[PDB]
From a paper:
[name] [name] has been studied extensively for its potential for cancer gene therapy by reducing the prodrug [name] to a cytotoxic derivative. The natural substrate of this flavoprotein enzyme is not known; however, it reduces a wide range of nitroaromatic compounds to hydroxylamines and also reduces quinones to quinols, with a bi-bi substituted (ping-pong) enzyme mechanism. The enzyme is a homodimer of two 24 kDa subunits with an extensive dimer interface. The two active sites are on opposite sides of the long central helix at the dimer interface, and the FMN is bound to residues from both monomers.
In the structure without nicotinate, there is an acetate group in the active site, and Q41 forms a hydrogen bond to the carboxyl group of acetate so that this ligand is in a slightly different orientation than in the structure of the wild-type protein bound to acetate, determined previously, where the hydrogen bond cannot occur. On replacing N71 with S71, in most of the structures of all the mutants, a water-mediated hydrogen bond to the FMN cofactor is found from the Oγ of S71 instead of the direct hydrogen bond from the NH2 of N71.
Numbering used by the authors:
A (entry chain A), B (entry chain B): 2 to 217
Write the structure that this text describes.
């Protein structure tokens, strides 16, 4: 029951480092990252999946200064996903996407492929050339991916925590992201919570719908 | 299982106007909106859930003329959700959130409540004063909610499509959002697809993980 999943999931504050994802689960989480929807299927993202001691430690360099409380979550979880956005939308990426759709069998005719490409270029250009908000627009798609991911990992019976509390400059530098064309946005440790996870037992809290939700 | 859901769900291109959500389903989609996570539990959002014909017509006004194909989808779906972000994170809202957390029993002591409020204020202030990205930060939380929602509604057996193809200035004006401190970001019609939904039977397409995903 997905509503049950949504109501029971929580942000894990402490992970049991001994409780790893199964091999299948580790593939499932990668599938969830890949299959998120995004505007124009633009998929403007890269993921770093850290599963080794060394790899997790590299990500954990970002939990410095104001962000030290994030460090243990990054080290102790089984798998840690760094969600990254492209820093600019380029035509090469646009072509990549449409060619992949063609390879996958989405276009019956050259005309259909060309109309798809034109539409995607129009939208991408509106953001980059006119609104000058392509970096934000791409970042929004990445956050959508995060939302899909958190629900999906809960539905697999896995714990996770989304983290904005990290130093993206440190994380980008550690992985050479800027030169590759990406920037780190959200870190999501995934695994199984320990008995020290005080948030596992605390009540969920949300604003009432009478504040947030209008029916018409 | 949730991976089946992720692999089978799609953006619906055409809705069967006769197929309405059940009352239970209409409550469930509200539950999904409310229970999404967000940075600091800041919940910087408002939802407009249009289920009457008049209501849906008000939302569909935003697509008139320039977003014709969008317009039809918003009219035909059972329930149409407008995802809105706050335009500023005011201290009233910060207090609302922490007081709600208190009401729900998340704090053992006044000290714990005060530390929570201080933390949230610090984050909000960093975005507003230093990063100059508070509107974007809130908008990102709203996109995360959308991601959660799309997977959740698919897992309920419902069809949907996320839509950026609408005129947010028009939608904002129609509902007086600017003065209320909100702006429209994404519209999500929800219901059941019709036989005209050509996308229901097309293969999904995503870039290969060898492009988008690095393991370490
Ligand atoms: C984008 C995002 C960033 C977050 N950053 C952090 C963080 O740095 N550290 C942390 O412990 N919790 C973090 N949280 C967890 C939130 O506090 C949490 O989602 C919210 O209080 C709702 O509780 P729940 O996730 O248990 O439903 C983050 C949440 C989101 C969605
Ligand atoms: C934020 C967002 C905005 C979108 N806007 C539109 C839109 O205005 N019209 C439309 O037909 N599809 C829209 N799409 C659907 C995407 O094209 C679709 O998600 C993508 O091609 C992946 O296909 P799937 O959703 O079937 O998995 C949007 C998707 C997202 C995530």
């Amino acid at each position: 029951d997905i509503i049950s999943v949504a109501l029971k999931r929580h942000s894990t504050k402490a992970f049991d480092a001994s409780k790893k994802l199964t091999p299948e689960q580790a593939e499932q989480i990668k599938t969830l990252l890949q299959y998120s929807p995004s505007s124009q299927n633009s998929q403007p993202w890269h993921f770093i999946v850290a599963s080794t001691e060394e790899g997790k430690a590299r990500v954990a360099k970002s939990a410095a200064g104001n962000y030290v409380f994030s460090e243990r979550k990054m080290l102790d979880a089984s798998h840690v996903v760094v969600f990254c956005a492209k820093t600019a939308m380029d035509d090469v990426w646009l072509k990549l996407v449409v060619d992949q759709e063609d390879a996958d069998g989405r276009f019956a005719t050259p005309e259909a492929k060309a109309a798809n490409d034109k539409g995607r270029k129009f939208t991408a250009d509106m953001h980059r050339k006119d609104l000058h908000d392509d970096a934000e627009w791409m970042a929004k798609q990445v956050y959508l991916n995060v939302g899909n991911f958190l629900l999906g990992v809960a539905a697999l019976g896995l714990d996770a925590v989304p983290i904005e509390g990290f130093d993206a400059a440190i994380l980008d530098a550690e992985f050479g992201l800027k030169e590759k064309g990406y920037t780190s946005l959200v870190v999501v440790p995934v695994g199984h919570h320990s008995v020290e996870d005080f948030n596992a037992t605390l009540p969920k809290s949300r604003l009432p719908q009478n504040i947030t939700l209008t029916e018409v």
